[PDB]
Amino acid sequence: MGSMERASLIQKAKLAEQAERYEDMAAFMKGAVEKGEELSCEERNLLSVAYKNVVGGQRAAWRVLSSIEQKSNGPEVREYREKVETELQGVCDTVLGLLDSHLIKEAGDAESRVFYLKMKGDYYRYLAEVATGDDKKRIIDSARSAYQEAMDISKKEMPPTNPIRLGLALNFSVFHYEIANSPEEAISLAKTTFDEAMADLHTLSEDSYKDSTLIMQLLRDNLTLWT
Amino acid sequence: MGSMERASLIQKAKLAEQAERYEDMAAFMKGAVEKGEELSCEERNLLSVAYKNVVGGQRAAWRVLSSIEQKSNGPEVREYREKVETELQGVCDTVLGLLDSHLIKEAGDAESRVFYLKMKGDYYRYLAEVATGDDKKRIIDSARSAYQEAMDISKKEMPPTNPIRLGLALNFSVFHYEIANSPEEAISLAKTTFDEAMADLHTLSEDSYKDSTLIMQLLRDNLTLWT
Amino acid sequence: AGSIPGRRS
Amino acid sequence: AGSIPGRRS
Numbered sequence: 001m002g003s004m005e006r007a008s009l010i011q012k013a014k015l016a017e018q019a020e021r022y023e024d025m026a027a028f029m030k031g032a033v034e035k036g037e038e039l040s041c042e043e044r045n046l047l048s049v050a051y052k053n054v055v056g057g058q059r060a061a062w063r064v065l066s067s068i069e070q071k072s073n074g075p076e077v078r079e080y081r082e083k084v085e086t087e088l089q090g091v092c093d094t095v096l097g098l099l100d101s102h103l104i105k106e107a108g109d110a111e112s113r114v115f116y117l118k119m120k121g122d123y124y125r126y127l128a129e130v131a132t133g134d135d136k137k138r139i140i141d142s143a144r145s146a147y148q149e150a151m152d153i154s155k156k157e158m159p160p161t162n163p164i165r166l167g168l169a170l171n172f173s174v175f176h177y178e179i180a181n182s183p184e185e186a187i188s189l190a191k192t193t194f195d196e197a198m199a200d201l202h203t204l205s206e207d208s209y210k211d212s213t214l215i216m217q218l219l220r221d222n223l224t225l226w227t
Numbered sequence: 228m229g230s231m232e233r234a235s236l237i238q239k240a241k242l243a244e245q246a247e248r249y250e251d252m253a254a255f256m257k258g259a260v261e262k263g264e265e266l267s268c269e270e271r272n273l274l275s276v277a278y279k280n281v282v283g284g285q286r287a288a289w290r291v292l293s294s295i296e297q298k299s300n301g302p303e304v305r306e307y308r309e310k311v312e313t314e315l316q317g318v319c320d321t322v323l324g325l326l327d328s329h330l331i332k333e334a335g336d337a338e339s340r341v342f343y344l345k346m347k348g349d350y351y352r353y354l355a356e357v358a359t360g361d362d363k364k365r366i367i368d369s370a371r372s373a374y375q376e377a378m379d380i381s382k383k384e385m386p387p388t389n390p391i392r393l394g395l396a397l398n399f400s401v402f403h404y405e406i407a408n409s410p411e412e413a414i415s416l417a418k419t420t421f422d423e424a425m426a427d428l429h430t431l432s433e434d435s436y437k438d439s440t441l442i443m444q445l446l447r448d449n450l451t452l453w454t
Numbered sequence: 455a456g457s458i459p460g461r462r463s
Numbered sequence: 464a465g466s467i468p469g470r471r472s
């Protein structure tokens with residue numbers, strides 16, 4: 001997208017979201033990132049929404065095919081699962097490459113740095129979901145390390161009700177439960193995150209209250225499922 | 228897909244449908260068609276389902292963008308609508324090329340020939356939905372001609388409750404109403420199709436009865452909307 | 455106006 | 464277990 005204006009790429013990313021053309025949206029936002037300028041809060045959200053939808057479709061397809069493959073155990077089901085898996089890994093590698101070149105190193109504010117590091121943890125987590133061989137442990141540790149740095153910054157720099165801090169804790173708790181085989185750590189993190197946010201709600205406006213309580217409900221939904 | 232077995236392409240098309248990977252499904256069925264053999268009833272359905280989903284996503288996006296474009300009247304919205312429109316036209320041209328090379332000319336049975344000619348009418352209709360300039364009239368006549376030949380065969384060779392005959396009449400009626408500016412012809416066709424199917428239901432098994440009445444309900448839904 | 459859905463085999 | 468949906472901006 002080197003020949004398109006940055007502002008036009010952002011505008012078309014918003015149009016693609018309205019049209020539910022998430023592959024286009026991701027390509028537009030990849031082009032915007034590669035312009036080399038830092039991203040605004042709104043622009044970071046567009047980047048995240050685009051790739052979450054693309055990878056979300058790939059993850060759903062991989063789970064369908066992996067389930068069919070396990071029920072069978074010709075080469076077609078394995079071959080097609082491998083093809084979807086390779087495409088998923090390519091998308092994750094593309095996102096991680098954008099974070100590494102050079103979104104994270106130029107992110108100095110807590111809101112931007114925590115956002116990108118949470119993304120890094122998320123896309124290593126998606127890689128871990130399909131990983132088996134020599135690198136699954138290293139991918140898991142890469143996810144954990146990114147989540148952990150984001151946690152450390154968010155505890156120092158953000159109030160307990162900050163939606164980025166809450167969503168980071170939510171996803172790190174899912175990492176603990178689903179990836180790291182640490183359900184007790186998952187439950188403890190979700191509980192402490194919820195309780196500390198509850199105690200900070202009195203400081204918020206009506207609109208901020210709605211934003212934070214929505215994510216706290218997701219933490220509560222998981223705790224209900226895990227206990 | 229020249230290096231993949233025909234049977235493997237068909238198997239993977241079914242897997243892609245289960246995974247809701249309709250672009251893959253269409254590519255697999257395009258590969259199967261290009262093997263040069265005629266398609267079975269089930270295989271024709273896979274071809275149709277795959278491309279209907281692909282073009283359906285493109286049509287939905289085009290309508291979203293066209294609506295935004297009309298509300299605005301920079302170049303971004305027009306440019307992006309044009310890009311989606313060009314991709315939609317490419318998909319329609321690909322399907323029409325498959326029908327012309329060489330599905331239709333090798334289709335001798337009524338069930339296969341009517342199925343393919345209905346497809347031809349459908350994908351010219353999708354081209355007509357976005358057509359404006361010098362060729363919109365010629366595209367409309369190409370759709371009408373394909374639908375008309377399919378109608379003529381289905382009246383001669385199929386019972387009035389045959390689901391292909393019913394679905395052909397349904398879509399031809401939508402063509403009349405939405406494309407050809409002939410709402411009276413649309414209503415008359417839907418009414419006569421419904422009434423003649425009703426009078427033939429007594430000949431059907433329990434399962435065939437369910438198949439036919441489902442499509443007759445779609446005819447009734449349109450008549451309710453049009454009258 | 456609805457054409458044949460035709461999105462599921 | 465639900466992560467952040469994050470599919471709508």
Ligand SMILES: *Cc1ccc(C(=O)NCc2nccn2C)cc1
Binds near residue numbers: 212469
């Ligand atoms: C990773 C993550 C965390 C939180 C959200 C979210 O939906 N936040 C709601 C909100 N309220 C004000 C501002 N924002 C972003 C999405 C993704």
Ligand SMILES: *Cc1ccc(C(=O)NCc2nccn2C)cc1
Binds near residue numbers: 395458
């Ligand atoms: C163009 C078209 C017409 C009809 C259908 C459909 O859903 N038919 C149901 C049915 N019952 C027995 C066999 N079939 C195909 C789909 C598309």
Ligand SMILES: [Ca+2]
Binds near residue numbers: 006
């Ligand atoms: Ca510029």
Ligand SMILES: [Ca+2]
Binds near residue numbers: 232233
């Ligand atoms: Ca062969």
Ligand SMILES: [Cl-]
Binds near residue numbers: 079080083239
């Ligand atoms: Cl494959």
Ligand SMILES: [Cl-]
Binds near residue numbers: 038106107108
């Ligand atoms: Cl900076």
Ligand SMILES: [Cl-]
Binds near residue numbers: 306
């Ligand atoms: Cl464009």
Ligand SMILES: [Cl-]
Binds near residue numbers: 336
């Ligand atoms: Cl033949």
